[PDB]
Amino acid sequence: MKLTIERAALLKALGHVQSVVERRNTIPILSNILLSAEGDRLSFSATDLDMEIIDEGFAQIDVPGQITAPAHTLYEIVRKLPDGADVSLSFDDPRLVIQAGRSRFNLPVLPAGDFPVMSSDGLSSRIAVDTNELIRLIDKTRFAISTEETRYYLNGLYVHTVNEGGETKLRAVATDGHRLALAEMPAPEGAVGIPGVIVPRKTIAEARRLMESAGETVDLQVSPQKVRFEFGAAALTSKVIDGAFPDYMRVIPRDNAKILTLDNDLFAKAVDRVATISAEKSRSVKLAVEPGRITLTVRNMEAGQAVEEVEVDYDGEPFEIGFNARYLLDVCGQIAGPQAEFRFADPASPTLVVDPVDPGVKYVLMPLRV
Amino acid sequence: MKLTIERAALLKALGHVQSVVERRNTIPILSNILLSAEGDRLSFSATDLDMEIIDEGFAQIDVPGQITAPAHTLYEIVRKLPDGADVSLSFSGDDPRLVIQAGRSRFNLPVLPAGDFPVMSSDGLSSRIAVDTNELIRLIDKTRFAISTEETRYYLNGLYVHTVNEGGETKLRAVATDGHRLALAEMPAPEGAVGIPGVIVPRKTIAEARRLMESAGETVDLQVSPQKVRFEFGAAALTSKVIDGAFPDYMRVIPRDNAKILTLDNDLFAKAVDRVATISSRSVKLAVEPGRITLTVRNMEAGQAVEEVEVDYDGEPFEIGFNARYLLDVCGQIAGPQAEFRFADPASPTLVVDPVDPGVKYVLMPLRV
């Protein structure tokens, strides 16, 4: 292998793929990038076995070939090279030689034949999804995905279509067992009837990162075993979580009749204030709801109390309900306009939060005893 | 105790003092702020036993008195109160808790008695010495990176602040070393500094003083004794113990007669060191010859990095090793485009000087790569 490539091109590709590589990874080849030179392109692949990121850059290829080399180290070297440098990559020592200006690096390689192969058999045809739309699906819901390390059905984003309101919707649902987030859009042409898949948490994160540099649309492919996002030259192919996502429709309350509307910014500030008396990781807040008012109370585990009254629009029966303060603030953080609407049943039942300026989202909070 | 105080004033004081409080403490009272109300002022004190920060703000005092309350919690509450809120503090009720009320919010915080709060004595201090704030900032920022980060009460874990008579002119000087490298910065001694005993100011004290310098005025007042140092920043003050020990005779470590003198482009050199060090505890080899330094790094897993850097030198060739981070740290302090290095043999301390600041000196200790 022998080629020359512009620093900016090399850096752009390296930066895109190297994100998947775990810092704390133990199998040496999974710390590497597969470099594949052919024609007028250098291809770049990295993986953590669950997902693979690929990217391509233009290069002047004197001799085609394939090698693997340490990903973060290669990225860091190139980052530190002078602006505008042309970079020579040469594989008669067995190391990859990187030369630019008056710098020369020799990096140990591992054989390209030991690098894992992510198969894309079985995928649907490409479905073009508006990029901003996809970004909204993710940003409205991903906070509710569980951060646990397991391969449990809660540790990813359930992407599926539903036939509702005279329209098929492309819908994303996240839950960690404590709260739920739902966001949807009109189903793009070709998405209607995709199989429902649970996209892993890390895959969503990496896809969302790549979306920051994407064009007008992102191509999506789906099978029951895989998902693929294409962002022009870059692509992310991932396994999906094997199992049955819960019947979340059973959790999302339809009939909650105690409806309350409030000033979301003022309420969120009040919740945040009263929650300040606790330095504890988990902080519960009591909402004493009555006509015209919510009285918020937080207590810590060292005798401290905080109370705040917030005027709200409500004229039903009084009741008291508790929520994890962070989960409540997370919901208020998603609301796009000045009001939030809450729908309650009894203090033991799930609570619905709706956004009057976005009918395409739903949030569910599960109550607790403080 | 009963008073009202403007949120901005309360927040400014709380923000100044609460920084000293350790996130974890085994003694509960050390997590607290001492609030002392009298006249037209609320006084604020916090401590970690090594040092104390105090501050005062204007307040309307209905009933004077003293109490202690959790510091970070109080700070966070006030920070989240609405802009322009007047804040009521009441040791009121019959409830034993401090009551903080503002707008439609009410907090009750557990208190500990003011009589159990530690007392930092400032007996024996010199008179106040006014130091230009930017000058003090320079003394610190030029040297503090070289203070050891160890938890011990060893003479290396702080900044040696002292005066020297050099060439018949008295300088206020700061020296830091961690045993691997050294930093020195100095200024003309402000009026009153001439007789100060040399003191070793603890690393955390320097950090906290330097933080308060960010919001200070044109000058900072310094006071010194062999047991204590005090920095005054208007209404706020930081009083600290000093490290009890004999700072080394660092003049013996700072080479005077190193004859192999080399000048280079500091930015280009630093970028090159940073490049080659990428593959690496991390040592770099400098192969010095007329016109050039060849930089080499190897790791313990077959990786090699080499870069040639043009330099101004016409002496004998030699090879010398440094910790790459320590070298980059020095290049980070150099104020203009060139750095000057003075070498003796590969086993000897190396001097780095800044052509646009004669008031600093850096020493690097070589190593075998």
Fold of A123-251: DNA Polymerase III; Chain A, domain 2 (3.10.150)
Determine contact: B306 vs chain A, CB below 8 A. Answer: yes
DSSP states of B39-61: TTEEEEEEE-SSEEEEEEEE-EE
The first and second tokens of residue B31, run together, are 């997590």
Determine contact: B29 vs chain A, CB below 8 A. Answer: no
Residue B46: how many other CB atoms lie within 10 Å: 26
Nearest CA in chain B to A303: B110
Q: Where are the alpha helices (DSSP H) in B193-322?
A: 203-214, 266-277
A77·B278 Cβ contact <8 A? yes
B74 contacts B14 by C-beta, under 8 angstroms: yes
Contacts 24+ apart (CB under 8 A), B248-255: B248/B155, B248/B177, B250/B160, B250/B175, B250/B177, B250/B182, B250/B184, B253/B177, B253/B182, B253/B349, B253/B363, B254/B182, B254/B184, B254/B349, B254/B351, B254/B361, B254/B363, B255/B342, B255/B344, B255/B348, B255/B349, B255/B350, B255/B351, B255/B363
- Tell me the CATH architecture of domain B254-369: Roll (3.10)
Contacts of B110 in chain A (CB under 8 A): 302-304
B297 contacts B282 by C-beta, under 8 angstroms: yes
B110·A310 Cβ contact <8 A? no
Nearest CA in chain B to A79: B275
The first and second tokens of residue A320, run together, are 């008291």
Element holding B135 (H helix, E strand): helix B133-141
Determine contact: B275 vs chain A, CB below 8 A. Answer: yes
Determine contact: A99 vs chain B, CB below 8 A. Answer: no
Q: What 8-state DSSP symbol labels residue A331?
A: H
Of B82, B108, B275, nearest to A80 by CB-CB distance is: B275
Residue ranges per domain, chain A? 1-122, 123-251, 252-370
Identify any residues that bridge with B101 across adjacent strands, giving them in sequence order: B88, B106
Residue B123: how many other CB atoms lie within 10 Å: 7
A107·B279 Cβ contact <8 A? yes
Longest dimension (CA), chain A: 83
- In whole angstroms, what is the distance from residue B242 CA to residue A282 CA? 40
Is the Cα torsion angle A82, A86, A87, A93 positive or negative in sign?
negative
**What are the distances in angstroms from CA B239 to CA A234, A341, B143, B170?**
58, 53, 21, 25
A276·B309 Cβ contact <8 A? no
A108·B302 Cβ contact <8 A? yes
Could you tell me which residues come within 8 angstroms of residue B217 by beta carbon, excluding any fewer than 6 positions away? B133, B233, B234
Rounded to 5 degrees, φ, ψ at A28 are -60, -40
Of A76, A103, A304, nearest to B307 by CB-CB distance is: A103
- In whole angstroms, what is the distance from residue B228 CA to residue B199 CA? 8
Determine contact: A303 vs chain B, CB below 8 A. Answer: yes
Contacts of B82 in chain A (CB under 8 A): 269
Which amino acid type is present at position A254? Answer: R
Of A95, A302, A305, nearest to B107 by CB-CB distance is: A305
Determine contact: B102 vs chain A, CB below 8 A. Answer: no
Of B104, B107, B275, nearest to A309 by CB-CB distance is: B104
Contacts of B72 in chain A (CB under 8 A): 279
How far is the alpha carbon of A274 from chain B, nearest alpha carbon, in Å? 8
Alpha-carbon torsion angle B55, B60, B65, B68, nearest 10: -50
Is the Cα torsion angle B356, B362, B367, B369 positive or negative in sign?
negative
Q: Domain A252-370: state its class.
A: alpha beta
B264 contacts B273 by C-beta, under 8 angstroms: no
The first and second tokens of residue A161, run together, are 């279509």
Contacts of B106 in chain A (CB under 8 A): 306-308
Determine contact: B97 vs chain A, CB below 8 A. Answer: yes
Determine contact: A294 vs chain B, CB below 8 A. Answer: no
Of B81, B110, B274, nearest to A302 by CB-CB distance is: B110
How far is the alpha carbon of A278 from chain B, nearest alpha carbon, in Å? 8
> B1-124 belongs to which homologous superfamily?
DNA Polymerase III, subunit A, domain 2 (3.10.150.10)
- In whole angstroms, what is the distance from residue B72 CA to residue B74 CA? 5
The first and second tokens of residue A299, run together, are 């207590």
Strands of the sheet with B32-38, listed across from one edge: B65-70, B32-38, B41-47, B51-58, B236-241, B228-233, B219-224, B129-132
Determine the number of helices (DSSP H) and then strands (DSSP E) in chain B: 6, 25
Which amino acid type is present at position B80? Answer: K
Determine contact: A102 vs chain B, CB below 8 A. Answer: yes
Fold of B125-253: DNA Polymerase III; Chain A, domain 2 (3.10.150)
Determine contact: B342 vs chain A, CB below 8 A. Answer: no
DSSP states of A250-305: GTS-S---EEEEEEHHHHHHHHHHHHTT--SSS-EEEEEEETTEEEEEEE-TTS-E
- In whole angstroms, what is the distance from residue A296 CA to residue A287 CA? 5
How determined? X-ray
Please report where in the chains the tokens 């309360």 appear, as a residue.
B10
The first and second tokens of residue B92, run together, are 């009121």
How far is the alpha carbon of A109 from chain B, nearest alpha carbon, in Å? 10
- In whole angstroms, what is the distance from residue A268 CA to residue A362 CA? 18
A276·B80 Cβ contact <8 A? yes
B106·A308 Cβ contact <8 A? yes
Nearest CA in chain A to B80: A273
> A1-122 belongs to which homologous superfamily?
DNA Polymerase III, subunit A, domain 2 (3.10.150.10)
**What are the distances in angstroms from CA B191 to CA B126, B163, B194, B206, B226?**
12, 12, 7, 22, 19
**What are the distances in angstroms from CA A215 to CA A136, A207, A210, B89?**
15, 13, 10, 56
First and final C-alpha spacing in chain A:
64
3 state SS of A362? strand
Of A102, A270, A304, nearest to B308 by CB-CB distance is: A102
Nearest CA in chain B to A93: B302
- In whole angstroms, what is the distance from residue A131 CA to residue A146 CA? 24
Please report where in the chains the tokens 């009272």 appear, as a residue.
B29
The first and second tokens of residue B3, run together, are 């008073």
Determine contact: A270 vs chain B, CB below 8 A. Answer: yes
Could you tell me which residues come within 8 angstroms of residue B269 by beta carbon, excluding any fewer than 6 positions away? B293, B309, B311, B331, B339
Query: Given this chain, do its domains B125-253 and B254-369 carry the same CATH topology?
Result: yes
Of A73, A82, A306, nearest to B279 by CB-CB distance is: A73
